[PDB]
Ligand binder design. Sequence first.
Ligand SMILES: [Mg+2]
Ligand SMILES: [Mg+2]
Ligand SMILES: [Mg+2]
Ligand SMILES: [Mg+2]
Ligand SMILES: [Mg+2]
Ligand SMILES: [Mg+2]
Ligand SMILES: [Mg+2]
Ligand SMILES: [Mg+2]
Length: 224
Amino acid sequence: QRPETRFLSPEFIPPRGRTNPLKFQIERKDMLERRKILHIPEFYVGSILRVTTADPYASAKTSQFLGICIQRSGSGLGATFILRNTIEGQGVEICFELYNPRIQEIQVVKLEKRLDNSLLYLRDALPEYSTFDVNMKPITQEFNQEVPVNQLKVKMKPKPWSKRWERPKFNIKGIRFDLCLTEEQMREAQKWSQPWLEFDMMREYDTSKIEAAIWDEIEASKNS
RNA sequence: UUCAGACCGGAGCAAUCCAGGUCGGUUUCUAUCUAUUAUAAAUUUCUCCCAGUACGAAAGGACAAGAGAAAUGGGACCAACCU
Ligand SMILES: [Mg+2]
Ligand SMILES: [Mg+2]
Ligand SMILES: [Mg+2]
Ligand SMILES: [Mg+2]
Ligand SMILES: [Mg+2]
Ligand SMILES: [Mg+2]
Ligand SMILES: [Mg+2]
Ligand SMILES: [Mg+2]
């Protein structure tokens, strides 16, 4: 059995603006020129990575970092992702540019999908979830063609949290809300819900034409 | 401060009073007329040097020239970040 679904790195998806499509073919040709030197592996928010940077100021030019991918955003050449880790008890985040020429090797130790598409809420979660072993070895993939969905509820510090996570606009399934909240506050949070949004139709973003076109563009670019 | 209430010194037999303190106390306008409603052509630090040299018995110790960084003020703009 060969389950086959093509994972397109999220920054090959052009934004909704009215920008002239000529711009996007340029960015694509550049970042696809970049793909051929530095190899960029798949990963998702929740997946654990280790990046090697060229560091001008250190003695060993290589700087090593390891953490969770908390969120990604961008498009074209300006793609970025954010790593999070606790070193010695200090919470540390880094923002990396995917296509930046300073980055030498990216390495995936654990490929994983956690329930929410961004976790900034690991800021208010207890220190365990942000801690990782600097030296852990890459734990490989069995080619199940199923990226494992780890459903893990989290514990949080007492309020306030850097954002209000209980409220509907965030759609957080990952947080454990029974232990961290009271019924009153769970009714409060329901006053900000906007039920009609999922049914808004016109607010929906259509892709697939573009998907076919640019995927064909990537095939065509690998061939040559 | 500056009215109406109120205490506390004091002054008056009192009513009341002292540019003496203290607490409290309504801030109204829908613009008729005149006036007016975006051109540009930078300013300042602090470093780095020079040169620890010129200057003085030593102790302390420069400008000028030349490379950098900022900050503020003009004019803009969202690839990223952040809202
Ligand atoms: Mg905050
Ligand atoms: Mg009296
Ligand atoms: Mg009052
Ligand atoms: Mg008063
Ligand atoms: Mg007034
Ligand atoms: Mg008029
Ligand atoms: Mg008016
Ligand atoms: Mg400015």
